[PDB]
């Protein structure tokens, strides 16, 4: 239904052992496709999903050749910011940026995206309108003043409104088997004796995609969120995720409570009980 | 696909 | 502004002992980008440990997995160790088969 391309920049200066270090990565909803990494022995934008490594040549020189200029672009901004705020030659800092669109069910435009962050909070972004800067203190604004007498911002727009949507539906189509495919979650419950009197009630979520879910334990038919551990939903490594919630239960009151479990790639919601 | 930053380098 | 990692370690596969699995450091919500990761077996250092491409959140914090090939037994102990700027000293999460 609604789907969404995301690419990950980050530099990070390292003052004494050379010159900083640019990653990037590119996700079409929870999915990587792509990375770059400048160290590496032979500094390529490399594919991390199938439906990608179809792509021509042509393709991989391009995206290759941009990866390379980003990285010179901002290790220009991280000695340019770093000027601006008169920092010390000592320390580390980072550059970040992170750009691209949603769109919906009909394939068009729902908003483009386009922040950067210096050392771990907002620097400036580009507003939902696609012809604003937002500049979060002195420094960005000088950057803002800067962007705006070149007119970037159009440029930004375009890439957005143009290339990053065309783009996304295309990889989109030639990854529908997966991409388009929702993965329902394998559930169970486990059982964890605390003492003679408590147990731990566990309810697991197993092999979803993508990474969005509901999990809920109930007591006879109603919530009991508060007194819910929850853990963050976390990757399996295998382009799957996994969550569990748990409660602590009465001893021979098991049967009084039921887990909950709602993910688009389920028709229905789902109950659990011990 | 990635866009394109050629020669921006001095809009920090 | 420094963030303090958090971390899981969990297996990709329900774990049984004797079958070949796949154990996960998954390490999240921290600055700076560096950091150091190892995973332990009976304490020891476990040599050919992945990790993968560092990437970051919505708030900006970054986030990275290590996993390692591991076969559960009754006996020996696994661990995600790591060191970072926000920490006075290392920190060790033991993997536990029920979380």
């Known amino acids: 239904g609604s789907h969404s391309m995301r690419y990950f920049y980050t530099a990070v200066s390292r003052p004494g052992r050379g010159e900083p270090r640019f990653i990037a990565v590119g996700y079409v909803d929870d999915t990587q496709f792509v990375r770059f990494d400048s160290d590496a022995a032979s500094p390529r934008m490399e594919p991390r999903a199938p439906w990608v490594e179809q792509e021509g040549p ?104 143009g290339t990053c949507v065309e783009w996304l539906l295309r990889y989109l189509e030639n990854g529908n088997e997966t991409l388009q495919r929702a993965d329902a979650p394998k559930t169970h419950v486990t059982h964890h004796p605390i003492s003679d009197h408590e147990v731990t009630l566990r309810c697991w979520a197993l092999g979803f995609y993508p990474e969005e879910i509901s999990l809920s334990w109930q007591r006879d038919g109603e919530d009991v969120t508060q007194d819910t551990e929850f853990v963050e939903t976390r990757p399996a490594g295998d382009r799957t995720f996994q969550k569990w919630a748990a409660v602590v239960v009465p001893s021979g009151e098991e049967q009084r409570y039921t887990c909950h479990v709602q993910h688009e790639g389920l028709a229905e919601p789902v109950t659990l009980r011990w | 696909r990635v866009e394109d930053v050629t020669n921006t380098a001095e809009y920090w | 502004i420094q963030k303090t990692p958090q971390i899981q370690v969990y297996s990709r596969h329900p774990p049984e002992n004797g079958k070949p699995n796949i154990l996960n450091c998954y390490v999240t919500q921290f600055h700076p980008p560096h950091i150091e990761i190892q995973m332990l077996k009976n304490g020891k250092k476990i040599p050919k440990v992945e990790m993968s491409d560092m990437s970051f959140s919505k708030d900006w914090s970054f986030y990275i997995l290590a996993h390692t090939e591991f076969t559960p037994t009754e006996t020996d102990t696994y661990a995600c160790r790591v060191k970072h700027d926000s920490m006075a000293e290392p920190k060790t999460v033991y993997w536990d088969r029920d979380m």
Not at chain 1, 89 to 111: I, K, N
């Open chain 1, 58 to 161: 042509e393709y991989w020189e391009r995206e290759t050749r941009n990866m390379k200029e980003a990285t010179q672009n901002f290790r220009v901004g991280l000695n340019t910011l770093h000027g601006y705020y008169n920092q010390s030659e000592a320390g580390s800092h980072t550059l970040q940026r992170m750009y691209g669109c949603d769109v919906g069910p009909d394939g068009r435009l729902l908003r483009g995206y386009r922040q950067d962050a210096y050392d771990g909070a907002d620097y400036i972004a580009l507003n939902e309108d696609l012809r604003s800067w937002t500049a979060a203190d002195a420094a960005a604004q000088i950057t803002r003043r800067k962007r705006e007498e070149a007119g970037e911002a159009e440029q930004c727009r375009n890439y957005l409104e």
